[PDB]
GROMACS .gro file of C-alpha atoms in nm:
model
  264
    1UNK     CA    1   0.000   0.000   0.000
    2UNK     CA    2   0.173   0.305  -0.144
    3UNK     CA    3   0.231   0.613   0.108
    4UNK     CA    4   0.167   0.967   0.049
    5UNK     CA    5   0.298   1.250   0.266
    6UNK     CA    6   0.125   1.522   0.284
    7UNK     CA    7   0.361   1.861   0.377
    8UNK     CA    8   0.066   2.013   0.622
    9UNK     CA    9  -0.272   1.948   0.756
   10UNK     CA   10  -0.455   2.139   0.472
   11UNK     CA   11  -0.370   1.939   0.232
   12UNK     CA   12  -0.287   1.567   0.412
   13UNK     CA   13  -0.753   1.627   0.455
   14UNK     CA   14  -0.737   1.727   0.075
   15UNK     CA   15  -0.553   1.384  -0.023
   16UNK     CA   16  -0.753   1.191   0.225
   17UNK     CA   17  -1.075   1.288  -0.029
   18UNK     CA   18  -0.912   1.175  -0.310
   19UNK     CA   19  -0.738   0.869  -0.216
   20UNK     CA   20  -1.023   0.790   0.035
   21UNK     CA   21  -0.737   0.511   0.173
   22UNK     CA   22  -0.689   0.381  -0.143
   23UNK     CA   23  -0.308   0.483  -0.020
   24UNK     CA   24  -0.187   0.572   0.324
   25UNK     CA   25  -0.183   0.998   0.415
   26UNK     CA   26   0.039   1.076   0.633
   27UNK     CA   27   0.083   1.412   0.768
   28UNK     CA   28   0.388   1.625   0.843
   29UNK     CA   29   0.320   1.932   0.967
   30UNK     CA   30  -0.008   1.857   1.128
   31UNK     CA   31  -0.318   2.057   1.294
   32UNK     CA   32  -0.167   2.265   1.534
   33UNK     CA   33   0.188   2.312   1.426
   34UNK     CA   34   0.284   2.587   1.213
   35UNK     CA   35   0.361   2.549   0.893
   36UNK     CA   36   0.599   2.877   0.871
   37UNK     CA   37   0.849   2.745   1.092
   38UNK     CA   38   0.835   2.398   1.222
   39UNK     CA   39   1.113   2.150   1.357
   40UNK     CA   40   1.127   1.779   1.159
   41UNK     CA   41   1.176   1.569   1.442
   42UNK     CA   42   1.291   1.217   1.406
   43UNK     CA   43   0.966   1.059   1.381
   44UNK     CA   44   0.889   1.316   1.123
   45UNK     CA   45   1.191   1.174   0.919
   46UNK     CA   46   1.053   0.835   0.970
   47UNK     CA   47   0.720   0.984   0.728
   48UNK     CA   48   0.969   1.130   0.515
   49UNK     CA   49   1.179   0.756   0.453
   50UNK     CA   50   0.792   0.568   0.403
   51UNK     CA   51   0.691   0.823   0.118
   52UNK     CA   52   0.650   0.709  -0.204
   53UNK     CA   53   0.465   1.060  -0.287
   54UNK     CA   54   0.564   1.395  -0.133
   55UNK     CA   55   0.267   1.643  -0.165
   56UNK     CA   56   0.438   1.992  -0.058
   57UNK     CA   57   0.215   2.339  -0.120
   58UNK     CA   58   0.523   2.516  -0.262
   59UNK     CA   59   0.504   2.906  -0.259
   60UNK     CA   60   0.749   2.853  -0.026
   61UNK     CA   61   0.569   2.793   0.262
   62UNK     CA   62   0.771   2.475   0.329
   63UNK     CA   63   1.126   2.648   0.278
   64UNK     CA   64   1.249   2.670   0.642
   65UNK     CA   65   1.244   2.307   0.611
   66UNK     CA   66   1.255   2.169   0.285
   67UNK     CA   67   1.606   2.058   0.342
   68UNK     CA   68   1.483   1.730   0.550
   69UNK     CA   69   1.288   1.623   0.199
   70UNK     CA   70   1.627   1.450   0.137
   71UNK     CA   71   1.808   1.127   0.120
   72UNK     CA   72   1.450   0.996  -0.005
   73UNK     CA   73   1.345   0.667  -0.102
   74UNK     CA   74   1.458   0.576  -0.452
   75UNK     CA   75   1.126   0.735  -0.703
   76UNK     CA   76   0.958   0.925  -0.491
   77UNK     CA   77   0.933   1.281  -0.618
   78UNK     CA   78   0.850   1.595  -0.415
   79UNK     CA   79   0.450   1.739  -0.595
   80UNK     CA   80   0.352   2.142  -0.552
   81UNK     CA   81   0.041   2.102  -0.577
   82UNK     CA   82  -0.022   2.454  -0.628
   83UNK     CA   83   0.122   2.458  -0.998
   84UNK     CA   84  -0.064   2.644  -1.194
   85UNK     CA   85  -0.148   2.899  -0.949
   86UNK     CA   86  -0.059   3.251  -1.017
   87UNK     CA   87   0.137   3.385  -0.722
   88UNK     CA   88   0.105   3.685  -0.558
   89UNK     CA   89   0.411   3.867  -0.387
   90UNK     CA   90   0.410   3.920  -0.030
   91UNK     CA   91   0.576   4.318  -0.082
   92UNK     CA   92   0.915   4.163  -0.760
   93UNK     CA   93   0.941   3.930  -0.424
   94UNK     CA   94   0.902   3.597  -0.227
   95UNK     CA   95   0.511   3.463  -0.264
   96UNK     CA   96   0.233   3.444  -0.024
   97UNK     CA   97   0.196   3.092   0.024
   98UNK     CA   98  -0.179   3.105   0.134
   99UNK     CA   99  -0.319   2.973  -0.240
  100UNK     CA  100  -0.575   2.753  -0.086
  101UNK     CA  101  -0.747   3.019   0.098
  102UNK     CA  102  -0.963   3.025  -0.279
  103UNK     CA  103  -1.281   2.890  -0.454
  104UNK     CA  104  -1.104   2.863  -0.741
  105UNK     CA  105  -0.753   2.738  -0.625
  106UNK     CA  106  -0.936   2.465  -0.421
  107UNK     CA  107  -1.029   2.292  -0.758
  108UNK     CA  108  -0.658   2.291  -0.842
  109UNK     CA  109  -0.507   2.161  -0.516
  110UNK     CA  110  -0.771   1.915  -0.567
  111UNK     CA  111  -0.682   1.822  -0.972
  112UNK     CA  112  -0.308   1.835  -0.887
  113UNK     CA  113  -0.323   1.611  -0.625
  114UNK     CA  114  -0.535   1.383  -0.875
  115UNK     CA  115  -0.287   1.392  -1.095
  116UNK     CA  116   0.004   1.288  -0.863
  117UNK     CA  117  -0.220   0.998  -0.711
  118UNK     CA  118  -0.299   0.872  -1.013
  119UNK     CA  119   0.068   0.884  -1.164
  120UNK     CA  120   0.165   0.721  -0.826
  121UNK     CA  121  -0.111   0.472  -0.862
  122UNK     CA  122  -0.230   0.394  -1.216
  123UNK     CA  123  -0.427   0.127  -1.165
  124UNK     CA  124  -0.690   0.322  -0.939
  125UNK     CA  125  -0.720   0.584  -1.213
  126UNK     CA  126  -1.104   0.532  -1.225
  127UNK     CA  127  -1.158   0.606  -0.868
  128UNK     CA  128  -0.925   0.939  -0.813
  129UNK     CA  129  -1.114   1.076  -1.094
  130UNK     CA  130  -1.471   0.941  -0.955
  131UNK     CA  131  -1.340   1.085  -0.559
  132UNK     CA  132  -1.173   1.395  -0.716
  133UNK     CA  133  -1.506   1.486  -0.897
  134UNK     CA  134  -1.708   1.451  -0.594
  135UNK     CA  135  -1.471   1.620  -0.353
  136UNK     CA  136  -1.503   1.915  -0.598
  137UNK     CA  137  -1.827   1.916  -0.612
  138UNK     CA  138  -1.881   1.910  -0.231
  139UNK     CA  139  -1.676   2.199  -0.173
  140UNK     CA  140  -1.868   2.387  -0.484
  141UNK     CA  141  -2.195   2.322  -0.305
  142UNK     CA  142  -2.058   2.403   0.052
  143UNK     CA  143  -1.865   2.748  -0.068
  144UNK     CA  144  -2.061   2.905  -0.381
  145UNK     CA  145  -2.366   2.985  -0.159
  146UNK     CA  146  -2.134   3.234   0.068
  147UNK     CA  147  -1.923   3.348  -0.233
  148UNK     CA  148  -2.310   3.380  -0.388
  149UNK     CA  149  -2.391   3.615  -0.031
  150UNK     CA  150  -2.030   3.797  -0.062
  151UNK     CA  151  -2.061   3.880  -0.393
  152UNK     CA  152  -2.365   4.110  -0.257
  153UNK     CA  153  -2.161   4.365  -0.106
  154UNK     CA  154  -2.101   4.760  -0.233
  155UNK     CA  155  -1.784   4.797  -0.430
  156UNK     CA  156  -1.688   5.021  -0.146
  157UNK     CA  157  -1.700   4.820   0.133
  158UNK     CA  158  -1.481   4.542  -0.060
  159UNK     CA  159  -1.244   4.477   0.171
  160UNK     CA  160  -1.103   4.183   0.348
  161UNK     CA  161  -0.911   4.297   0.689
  162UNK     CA  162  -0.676   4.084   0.871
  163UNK     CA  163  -0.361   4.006   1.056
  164UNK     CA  164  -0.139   3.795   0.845
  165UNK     CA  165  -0.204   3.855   0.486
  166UNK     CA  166  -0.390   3.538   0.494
  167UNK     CA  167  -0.640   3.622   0.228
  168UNK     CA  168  -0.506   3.767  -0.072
  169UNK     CA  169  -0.596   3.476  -0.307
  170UNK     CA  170  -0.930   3.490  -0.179
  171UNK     CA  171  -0.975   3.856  -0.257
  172UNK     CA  172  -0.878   3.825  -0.602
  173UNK     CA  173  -1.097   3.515  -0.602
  174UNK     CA  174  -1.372   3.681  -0.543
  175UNK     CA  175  -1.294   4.057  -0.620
  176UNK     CA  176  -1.168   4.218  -0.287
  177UNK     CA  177  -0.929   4.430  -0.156
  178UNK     CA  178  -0.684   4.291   0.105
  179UNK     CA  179  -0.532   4.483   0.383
  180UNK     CA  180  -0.327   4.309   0.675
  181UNK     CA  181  -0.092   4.355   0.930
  182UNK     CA  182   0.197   4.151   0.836
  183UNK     CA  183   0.269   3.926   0.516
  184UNK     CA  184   0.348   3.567   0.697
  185UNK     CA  185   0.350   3.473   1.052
  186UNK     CA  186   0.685   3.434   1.249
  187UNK     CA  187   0.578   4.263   1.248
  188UNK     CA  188   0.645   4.602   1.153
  189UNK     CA  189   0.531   4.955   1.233
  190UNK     CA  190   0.472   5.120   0.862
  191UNK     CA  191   0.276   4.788   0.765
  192UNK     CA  192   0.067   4.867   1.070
  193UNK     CA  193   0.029   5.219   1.041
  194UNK     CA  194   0.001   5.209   0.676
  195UNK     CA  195  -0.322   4.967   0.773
  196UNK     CA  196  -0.455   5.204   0.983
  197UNK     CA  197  -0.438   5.498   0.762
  198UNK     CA  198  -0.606   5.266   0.439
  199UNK     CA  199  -0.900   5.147   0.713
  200UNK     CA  200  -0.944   5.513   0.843
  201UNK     CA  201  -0.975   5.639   0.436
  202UNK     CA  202  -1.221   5.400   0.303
  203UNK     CA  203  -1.428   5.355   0.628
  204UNK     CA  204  -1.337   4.958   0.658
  205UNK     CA  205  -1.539   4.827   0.965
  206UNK     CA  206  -1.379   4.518   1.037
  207UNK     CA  207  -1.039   4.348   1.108
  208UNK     CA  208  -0.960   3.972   1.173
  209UNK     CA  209  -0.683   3.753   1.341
  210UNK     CA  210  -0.640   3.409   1.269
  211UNK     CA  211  -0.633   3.107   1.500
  212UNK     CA  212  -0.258   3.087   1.499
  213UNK     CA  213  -0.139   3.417   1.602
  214UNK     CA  214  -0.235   3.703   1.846
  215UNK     CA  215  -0.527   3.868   1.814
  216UNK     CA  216  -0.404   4.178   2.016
  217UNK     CA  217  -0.253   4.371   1.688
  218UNK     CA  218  -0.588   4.349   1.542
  219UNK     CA  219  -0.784   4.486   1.853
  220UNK     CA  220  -0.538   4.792   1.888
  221UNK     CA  221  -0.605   4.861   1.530
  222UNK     CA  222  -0.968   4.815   1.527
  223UNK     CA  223  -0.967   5.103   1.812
  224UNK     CA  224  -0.723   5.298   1.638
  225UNK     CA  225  -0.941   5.324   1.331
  226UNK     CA  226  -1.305   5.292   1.533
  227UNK     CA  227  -1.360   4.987   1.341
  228UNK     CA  228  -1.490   4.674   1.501
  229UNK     CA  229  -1.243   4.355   1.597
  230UNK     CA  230  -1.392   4.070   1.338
  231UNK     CA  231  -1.292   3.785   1.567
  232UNK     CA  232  -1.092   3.490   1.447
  233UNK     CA  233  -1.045   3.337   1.115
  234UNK     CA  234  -0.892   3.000   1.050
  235UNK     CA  235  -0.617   2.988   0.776
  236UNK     CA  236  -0.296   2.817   0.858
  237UNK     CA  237  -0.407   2.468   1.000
  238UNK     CA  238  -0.717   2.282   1.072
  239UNK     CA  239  -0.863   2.286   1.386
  240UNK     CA  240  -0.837   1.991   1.640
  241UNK     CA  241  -1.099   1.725   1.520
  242UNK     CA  242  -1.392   1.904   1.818
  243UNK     CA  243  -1.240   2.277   1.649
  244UNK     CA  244  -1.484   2.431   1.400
  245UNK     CA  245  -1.185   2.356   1.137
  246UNK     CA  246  -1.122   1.970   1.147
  247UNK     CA  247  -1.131   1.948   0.761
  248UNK     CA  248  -1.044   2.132   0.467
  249UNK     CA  249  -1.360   2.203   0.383
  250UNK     CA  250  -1.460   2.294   0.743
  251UNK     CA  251  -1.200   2.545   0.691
  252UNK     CA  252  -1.325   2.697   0.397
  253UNK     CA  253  -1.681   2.710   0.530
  254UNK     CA  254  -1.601   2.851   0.848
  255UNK     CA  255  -1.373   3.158   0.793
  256UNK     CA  256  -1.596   3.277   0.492
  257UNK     CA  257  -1.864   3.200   0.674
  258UNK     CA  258  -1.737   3.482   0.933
  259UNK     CA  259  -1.633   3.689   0.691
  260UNK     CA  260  -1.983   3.691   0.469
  261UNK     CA  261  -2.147   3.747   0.821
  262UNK     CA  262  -1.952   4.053   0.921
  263UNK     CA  263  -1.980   4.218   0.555
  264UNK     CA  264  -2.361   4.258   0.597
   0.00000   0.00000   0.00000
């Protein structure tokens, strides 16, 4: 039975709809953990040996550790499974990793993983592309009715607000503006003034944190520019299985969810 390492939680629950244990997922960076700067311990090496499949998210979110997928068992190749995705820079710069945080980019984690299972596993060709299709299609139906309610809102008030810049491939998903404190987890003054000043001008009434970092930058701006604190959003990792977050999907659901319901 074939292995498939998944680099973080996000997208070990994306495999596990597509294989549906046709193969083993395995996780390396799982729920909890962060994905921006995380120690591979040996038992995490022990995942890395057992691969046969390596699904990383690329956009260098894996680079501060990238150097333990090495000394790898003979064939198994290292997939970014966000190829095909259009990056956009964190500042000509290093990428915000945070592709799946997307309608749209959900449907090509989803068909890149395909691919890679099914190249890894030919003979169950007929059943990624069955589980793939649904898996699509459930996410579709769960997300389109909020992107459906987003899409509602005055050009003006088009603005997604938060502490890492979490969202910026959902906001040009859907047609937003994104304005955050700091580009990846792991600060700086002019980013948060500079926040301030754009919330202050356009009248923005809402700023988020995110379930991995603190939410006390956000309050202090919210004050600062008499908007309201937006509570938390998760982005980085799923919850723990009783969290609102425990899948992929869950994810998805949840922190658009928020944000539809603090847009209206």
């Amino acid at each position: 039975k074939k292995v498939v390492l998944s680099s973080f939680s996000i997208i070990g629950d994306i495999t596990q709809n597509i294989a549906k244990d046709l193969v083993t997922v395995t996780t390396l960076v799982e729920a909890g953990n962060d994905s921006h700067s995380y120690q591979v311990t040996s038992a995490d090496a022990i995942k890395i040996q057992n691969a046969d499949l390596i699904l990383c998210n690329g956009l260098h979110l894996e680079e501060t550790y990238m150097k333990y997928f090495t000394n790898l068992k003979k064939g198994t190749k290292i997939i970014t499974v966000t190829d095909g995705i259009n990056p956009i820079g964190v500042s000509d710069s290093e990428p915000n990793p945070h592709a799946w945080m997307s309608l749209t980019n959900a449907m090509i984690y989803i068909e890149n993983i395909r691919k890679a299972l099914t190249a890894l596993d030919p003979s169950n060709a007929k059943k990624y592309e069955l589980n793939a299709r649904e898996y699509s299609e459930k996410i579709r139906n769960s997300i389109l009715p909020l992107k459906t309610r987003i899409e509602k809102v005055d050009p003006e008030k088009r603005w997604f607000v938060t502490s890492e810049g979490c969202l910026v491939y959902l906001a040009e998903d859907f047609g937003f503006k994104s304005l955050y404190l700091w580009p990846i987890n792991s600060r700086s003054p002019s980013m948060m003034r500079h926040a301030i000043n754009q919330m202050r001008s356009h009248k923005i009434k809402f700023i988020f944190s995110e379930s991995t970092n603190s939410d006390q930058p956000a309050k202090q701006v919210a004050y600062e520019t008499n908007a309201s604190y937006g509570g938390v959003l998760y982005v980085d990792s799923l919850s723990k299985p009783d969290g609102p977050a425990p899948t992929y999907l869950d994810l998805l659901r949840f922190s658009l969810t928020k944000i539809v319901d603090t847009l209206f």
